[PDB]
Write a protein that binds this ligand. Structure first.
Ligand SMILES: [Zn+2]
Ligand SMILES: [Zn+2]
Ligand SMILES: [Zn+2]
Ligand SMILES: [Zn+2]
Ligand SMILES: [Zn+2]
Ligand SMILES: [Zn+2]
Lengths: 75, 100, 101, 216, 105, 78
């Protein structure tokens, strides 16, 4: 398996996929807007009640939503 | 290990699924009822004050990982011997042992 | 199969980074989406040049005229009106129902 | 049909425990009797709060867990930190290639050091006595409140030989109204006669302090 | 089991019958379902070893192949004293699995 | 009177020290001594809530006793 690679570890590949999705989506979120918690979750720092969201995919989908946009323009 | 040294082996806490020739099942008697874990603690585990203290290989002087072993895994594999007593369990005249 | 919310978010960001000729790189980011489905989702619905507003009076008149002209040919018609062919199609059916009353 | 808080408070043997809602109880006499019994711990305070327990904005910024000291003495944290800092640099090719050609003896701490961490250097942590229930703000409101007549070393800022500078004026302005029973030297406390401190000396001479039954 | 809230124990007055466990259930505790540290032998009530049922599994009901024990923790908490620990109803999970396979197969 | 306003301080002085300073007189139940975030330093004025009136009445007098870093401190009702 050294000379030509054999097989693939689909669980670790899925871990890598989660990292690459995270890096991609994170580069479009400015550093003030998102606060990363101790366990790897994310809070929205715009919205006054700080909702906490499990992934960066959910944080991006939240930042699309109308509650966030209304809370955004006040800040 | 060789066949006489296998009473010196430690056992896994959960029972083996292949029941025959097991050492840790109820029927074998190696998993006993009403075990007090404090009394059987130092059995087949490292005890620096007790009888099984942290040993090193007699050949390469690097630390073994099994209690009561005098030879580290690599040296025992290469010479063909039991890791505890050093009796040979394998005839290695025709085997170019590869550590890789 | 169907497009979740978070998948659309990933797809928009990934097109913004990698552009529109690398759908195999974009498919690697999503779960169980192929490259062709990513492309189709982008042009159908997620592209910013798609206009999701209400129909003007002019745009409707061109729709009714061109649908008389070339019947059932919505890919030919659709760039002349500047809506998606699916959008053009459902709005045509809306107006036909409306004229039935 | 039901008590108001004043009748209930007089009817208790101890009226400091009664709250607004205890009158709404189906048996309020027994409830306030049980709240004033010794060594019982009160109902967790968030039973009436609308927000869920521990789901609060201050809890967002909690820092990571810190290891104890006897574990950081092993050097586990520096080794494993370096290890996972290399493993983010590797590609999937390289990781799947060292999974067929492994690398022995990498992250090994000698057994004697690990045994000593657990069987020699272990220290008991700070523990809490019974009835000290956790609530949500607790670890920030743990500063408490130090009484007059007891000074901190730092309050060094005064730099005065040992009485208080303010007292030279408390005798002038009077004893403060807020404290009815406070006692300070020179006003109503001996610097009469001063035999109070001699009592503590004589008693302290009297005591044997040898704990019975300890290890030799 | 502890994993199924709708299962129900017999809990009658246990007798001299020894409860047994099928190959699938071998080595686990009847109450808390653990694999470690077996402390006491399980006794089942008379009705539960009536007739053909004599010697079936306590936990599932299959052909029993070894004796059932309580673990040490269930002994210390005296969970071994509540009654016959035979499970008397199949429950939703077992039934659903059957109809699902039968639909497919 | 339960609260007092305290002026004219040096940032080395701290809220915990301040609590011990005024509890020398009588206990400060609620302490407030602003931390300014922008330049990370204190302007030196304080607000103190007590148990009841007792702490407040003493408050003004407590000011005379106070002397931080060779300087006085304003205490008045609020
Ligand atoms: Zn938001
Ligand atoms: Zn060796
Ligand atoms: Zn041997
Ligand atoms: Zn079974
Ligand atoms: Zn158990
Ligand atoms: Zn029964």
């Amino acid at each position: 398996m050294s000379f030509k690679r054999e097989g693939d570890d689909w669980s670790q590949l899925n871990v890598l996929k989660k990292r690459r999705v995270g890096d991609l989506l994170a580069s479009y979120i400015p550093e003030d807007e998102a606060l990363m918690l101790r366990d790897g979750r994310f809070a929205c720092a715009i919205c006054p009640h700080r909702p906490v969201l499990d992934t960066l995919a959910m944080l991006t989908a939240h930042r699309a939503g109308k509650k966030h946009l209304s809370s955004l323009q006040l800040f | 290990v060789c066949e006489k040294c296998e009473k010196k082996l430690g056992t896994v806490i959960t029972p083996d699924t292949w029941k025959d020739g097991a050492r840790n099942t109820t029927e074998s008697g190696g998993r006993k009822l009403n075990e007090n874990k404090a009394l059987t603690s130092k059995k087949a585990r490292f005890d620096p004050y007790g009888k099984n203290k942290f040993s090193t290989c007699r050949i390469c002087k690097s630390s073994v990982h099994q209690p009561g072993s005098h030879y580290c895994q690599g040296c025992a594999y290469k010479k063909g011997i039991c890791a505890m007593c050093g009796k040979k369990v394998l005839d290695t005249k025709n085997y170019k042992q590869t550590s890789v | 199969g169907v497009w979740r919310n978070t998948e659309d978010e990933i797809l928009k960001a990934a097109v913004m980074k990698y552009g529109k000729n690398q759908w195999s790189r974009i498919a690697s980011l999503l779960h169980r989406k192929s490259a062709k489905q990513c492309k189709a989702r982008w042009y159908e619905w997620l592209d910013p040049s798609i206009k999701k507003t209400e129909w003007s009076r002019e745009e409707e008149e061109k729709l009714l005229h061109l649908a008389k002209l070339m019947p059932t040919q919505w890919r030919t018609i659709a760039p002349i009106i500047g809506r998606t062919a699916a959008q053009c199609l459902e709005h045509y059916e809306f107006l036909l129902d409306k004229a039935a009353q | 049909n039901r008590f108001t808080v004043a009748e209930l408070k007089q009817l208790v043997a101890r009226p400091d425990v009664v709250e607004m809602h205890d009158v709404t109880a189906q048996d309020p006499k027994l409830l306030v009797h049980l709240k004033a019994t010794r060594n019982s711990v009160p109902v967790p305070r968030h039973w009436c709060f609308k927000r869920k327990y521990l789901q609060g904005k201050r809890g967002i910024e909690k820092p990571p867990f810190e290891l104890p000291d006897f574990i950081k003495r092993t050097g586990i944290q520096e080794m494993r930190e370096a290890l996972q800092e290399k493993e983010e640099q590797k590609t999937m090719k390289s990781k799947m290639r060292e999974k067929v050609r492994p690398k022995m003896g990498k992250i090994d701490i000698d057994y004697q050091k690990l045994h000593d961490a657990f069987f020699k250097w272990q220290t008991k942590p700070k523990l809490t006595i019974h009835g000290d229930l956790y609530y949500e703000g607790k670890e920030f409101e743990t500063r408490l409140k130090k009484k007059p007549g007891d000074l901190s070393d730092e309050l060094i800022s005064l730099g005065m030989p040992v009485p208080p500078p303010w007292l030279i004026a408390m005798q002038r302005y009077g004893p403060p109204p807020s404290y009815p029973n406070l006692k300070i030297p020179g006003l109503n406390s001996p610097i009469g006669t001063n035999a109070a401190e001699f009592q503590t000396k004589t008693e302290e001479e009297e005591i044997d302090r040898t704990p019975w039954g300890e290890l030799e | 089991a502890k994993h199924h809230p709708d299962l129900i124990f017999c809990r009658k007055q246990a007798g001299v019958a020894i409860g047994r466990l099928c190959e699938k259930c071998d080595g686990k505790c009847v109450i808390c379902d653990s694999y470690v540290r077996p402390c006491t032998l399980v006794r089942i009530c008379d009705e539960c070893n009536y007739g053909s049922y004599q010697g079936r599994c306590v936990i599932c009901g299959g052909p029993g192949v070894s004796d059932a024990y309580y673990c040490k923790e269930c002994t210390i908490q005296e969970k071994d004293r509540d009654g016959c620990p035979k499970i008397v109803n199949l429950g939703s999970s077992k039934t659903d699995l059957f109809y699902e396979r039968k639909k497919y197969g | 009177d339960a609260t007092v306003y305290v002026g004219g301080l040096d940032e080395k002085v701290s809220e915990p020290l301040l609590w011990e300073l005024f509890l020398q007189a009588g206990p400060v139940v609620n302490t407030h001594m602003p931390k300014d975030r922008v330049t990370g330093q204190h302007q030196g004025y304080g607000f103190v809530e007590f148990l009841s009136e007792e702490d407040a009445d003493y408050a003004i007098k407590i000011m005379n006793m106070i002397k931080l870093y060779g300087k006085p401190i304003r205490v008045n009702k609020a």
